[PDB]
Design a protein around this ligand. Structure first.
Ligand code: NA
Lengths: 369, 369, 375, 374
């Protein structure tokens, strides 16, 4: 018997505020200059945002408008009052951005545990955090505020997901809300049960789930208030929830291998599982200084393969071009597509269509096998 | 298969931030062992921004934070605009205000004397040595910023070849890369480390050695760049070899389970391996809201156990007290010991004695088994 | 015919926010270490405060608490909501002050002024402007007009004929306020009644003709957001407001954020004190006193009086009496005015001179008897 | 006997670094968008610059380039090394300026001129600025290459019955390289290359400098400078920028403000009026006052104080100014041609009486008009 826990946070969590600002700046630059080199870090703490780093760009007007891009993103997140702890219209914004082959091993992962081919704990955690935001923004639960966190504990027996053990949903809200009479039943109804009905897991036993809504009580203020956040401090939330395997994504243009190769490996892994070649797979790519193409491409199927792993590797080599320039080309990465990736996970998204989540190589793999 | 891990010196801008965050933590703990600390650092060209939240009676230490920051930067070795950054003259801004569901992991493997995976162990040995030869004046033209990368070739899980070593280091502008830097780094850093390690079977006879493959490296640190606390988690832990339960360490007092429980799991795993109970082990601890002690303690021995895994788990239960208060007590964590952890890895350190690296539970485990 | 205009601002004006923060930090340090050396500058802009400079102090706890001192001062000013443009509880605060523990004079010319135009011996335009800005704040803080918000500005224009103040020409009062307030039906009459008319009754000028004053309340209209919002402020940017409203010459240098060892501050204070006592002693109707210092000498090398023809005693005799009665060595000024005390935050708005609401050492008429007996 | 002291500082003084950054930003914006609204404040302290305020502008490329403009200004000032206390290439720069695209005041302002110097400025400030400019010049031209940017000058003149009789004291404090012997090298070099050359330039017909007390770095070594261990802000040298304390000020700093700010353009216009009045021979010295009212473009008052030195009835002088000058703010901006990138040079060495650059408000182009109108 094993327990596995993963978590997700809303776009209002102070670390995720930074990821989104970083990727909003990236997007704004790429929209006007697809060739922009961007490495932009964001810090938030009580009442202030500090955006720093380096860019090379011809998008001078977009660069000039970064301060406005910052405020607009914070307002979109929903921080529009001191009463909520943070206000995009009135907060401090300081900008300190300058403007004028490698050895590596990267991993990607997929598993037939959910429709989106993600491990169950992180998949359910992201579905819950996204729904928590949706019910606030659509006016379903209009007393909600932006900050929030979800945690999912699944009980396993011999690698089989048998029970939904614990779900924790913590959300910011207006001060006059009764936690027991209002928040608890509303969250259970509009967020948890709605998500569980969506997922429609064929075998998971949710009959005795321990559900904890705001277990630490009132959550009136949030975000940077009495706290701090930074870009790239939610890597495990951004990826596989600790289920599978460095370098953060947000604020980096796709020339950063930490981002584009991680994306490429997810794409490969997902297409391999969807091709029915394995129930679960970790794909590793090894790069060497002075070689564009990988020097190694390895598959681990954990005994779940339906073909010899060496043939899976051969098929991947034939179907995918894992040179960095080819990855960027094939995944059409030189576009302002990054702000949405900055909360609710980079992998297994059910609400937006991302290039590295497309099952557009399934038939190619099958034919190549 | 090929496996690569990386380490960076204390001069890398992200590591400057980790060190500043933990230097502030240490200063507060030295005067008030019960301090609550969550301190994040940002660096970019010519400036440091330290933010977060503290609860402390160490008001004198809090007041002296700006001086603690400058002293740390000078110790790192940034003491001139010619090097790209100067602790004595740079900008310093301070904006610090003044259970849970969880799964944490720890890992150990009999691949090195320090019981760490070989790629990260060698990368950290190399980065420490690179700093050592600079500070003691052996190679006096070296400057603080640097990076090491180690690629090991494996055949059926046996480390058979040292495939590639990359050492990149900052240096004075007048240095001949081929006549001076290359042989000096080979002799004083790489070869001494290899001789120190004295691996009984690893073949180093055809290692590809690259010293500053991208050429001159004169300016470094935050210059024309940016760093943040907690952006080198893979370097801080197992180099990608073993999974992380998520969460950065630096700037956080021991009450933060992300830090202390990760340390505890390393401690458990290392003692299990040292006790000969397995060649390699991942230990997992599961916590539930409302319970002090873990609701789960799981061992994965990858087929390398010398006793039944359930018996190992039983022994760990008897020997270790994994309540948060007990971990803090048993590892004597309420002390100023953290600044040294902020570069060269938190795990597997040879150069400093860390409580979670002690083999002080080996005999207890052997008797309990 | 002549017109003279001076202005004042409330403690909510963004430059005045900075002056108050700077002197609030000064006061906190002096309270625990009276010998603290302090040169603290404050910047504000949308949503953020930046406090910078250098301090030498043993008041380490006070130094650690500076961020709390900053937030408390902003809340006292009245900025407690994003709806007002600024919130002390939730705004950004960054501290970049160099700090150390402890352990000749300059060439200078400093000026002080006084004039029998008002009870507080200040020029009429600045005196009235300060009384108005102070009353504006008062009626907000005491709940008389609770819809007011912190930021505000007053302007007073006086018409003179042959140097006599004959007419109150124009009064401008601009004030921040809640969004729903009717400018013509509520704000205008409330401000006239509770601010302008009360101040005029307080002053009770025996001869000034206020019968045709042009009164303008919020001439530009709605004033809902204020302070640093969509603006910026810095310490030391309201020097004319802080002193004589342009009526009298300045020897340069701002006051706030500076401990009393800064001659720009303490000597300007000493010269006011001298001028005020000279006028109160009946020695002149108006006077500018100038002190000259030389490097290497503590005591002044020159002490000059300009009475603009209004003296009742030979100016040389006035200078002689000042020389006997006053000790204008910087060290003596500090000791005699008892300046090493947390007394500065109140000076940071509504003027450093002529204050009718607080007792300041350099405003004390405690040297009149000495001058009369010395002459 | 009376003593009057004024001071000036070099472009390297931390407050002047701020004024220059603020006006360099203004210039860059005006160059591409002459209608830009600019209110830009600069702060400096150890190792960092913070530029804040608000701009309305179409000059988006110039706005994007503000950080580079800041660094280039600091480098031109001469701060290029941690060894000097500050380096424009490596220092921190943060920009907190609000930015948008385009979509009456009660006042009394003063201007002043006096026939005490060729530039029609009071002698103490005129000499102080001449000295601070020459101090910078001998560093930049390599005459005294060991000098560094920061410095300050003070001039004390002794007066007898309003006549400047003696140069009493000169204080020159300057940043310098660490190895320099203050007493044996700096002191005589400064006496020779800075003070004596300035006195030769001025060639004052009566001022007796024979026993001037000269103090070079009286407080000792000055190796580090600028923001190092200090702080500066825009608009904190108002008396240096204007008349050195000799003449009254109707409030408000100049730098970082576009010409629509009456604090700047009206102060400039008043200097212009006053200078032309003296140069027209209508008085030896004059303070001109302009009064403005809310809701009227043209002044509601224009007054002259000639301090008994007039050669024509003060009321006639006031009438002549009324005919010759259009003191509506829009007219001032048009007639002085203010919507141009001309402001960075004004940010050190004084806005008035400049002998090294040509400023519109220093031109004697209304002298003939005044004589015809009088
Ligand atoms: Na003499």
């Amino acid at each position: 018997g094993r327990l596995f826990t993963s978590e997700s946070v809303t776009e209002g969590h102070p670390d995720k505020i930074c990821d989104a600002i970083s990727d909003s700046v990236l997007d704004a630059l790429l929209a006007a200059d697809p060739r922009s080199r961007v490495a932009v870090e964001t810090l938030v703490t009580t009442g202030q945002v500090h955006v720093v780093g380096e860019v090379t760009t011809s998008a001078k007007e977009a660069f000039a408008d970064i301060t406005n891009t910052v405020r607009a993103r914070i307002l979109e997140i929903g921080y529009d009052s001191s009463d909520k702890g943070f206000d995009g219209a009135t907060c401090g914004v300081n900008i300190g951005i300058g403007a004028q082959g490698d050895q590596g091993l990267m991993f990607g992962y997929a598993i037939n545990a959910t429709p989106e081919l993600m491990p169950l704990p992180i998949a359910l955690a992201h579905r819950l955090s996204r729904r928590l935001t949706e019910v606030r923004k659509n006016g379903v639960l209009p007393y909600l505020r932006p900050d929030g966190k979800t945690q999912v504990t699944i009980a396993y027996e011999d690698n089989v997901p048998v029970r939904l053990d614990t779900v924790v949903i913590s959300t910011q809200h207006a001060a006059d809300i009764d936690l027991e009479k209002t928040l608890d039943p509303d969250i259970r109804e509009k967020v948890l049960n709605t998500v569980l009905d969506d997922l429609a897991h064929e075998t998971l036993d949710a009959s005795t789930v321990r559900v904890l809504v705001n277990p630490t009580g009132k959550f009136v203020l949030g975000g940077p208030m009495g706290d701090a956040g930074l870009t790239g401090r939610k890597i495990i939330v951004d990826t596989y929830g600790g289920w599978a395997r460095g370098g953060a994504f947000s604020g980096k243009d796709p020339s950063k291998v930490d981002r584009s190769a991680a994306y490429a490996m997810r794409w490969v892994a997902k297409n391999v599982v969807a091709a029915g070649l394995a129930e679960r797979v970790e794909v590793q790519v090894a790069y060497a200084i002075g070689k564009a193409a990988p020097v190694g491409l390895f598959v681990e199927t954990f005994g779940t393969e339906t073909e010899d792993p060496v043939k899976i590797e051969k098929a991947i080599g034939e179907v995918f071009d894992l040179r960095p320039g080819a990855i960027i080309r094939d995944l059409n990465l030189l576009r302002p597509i990054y702000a949405p990736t900055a909360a609710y996970g980079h992998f297994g998204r059910t609400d937006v269509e991302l290039p590295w989540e497309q099952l557009d190589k399934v038939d190619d793999l099958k034919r190549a096998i």
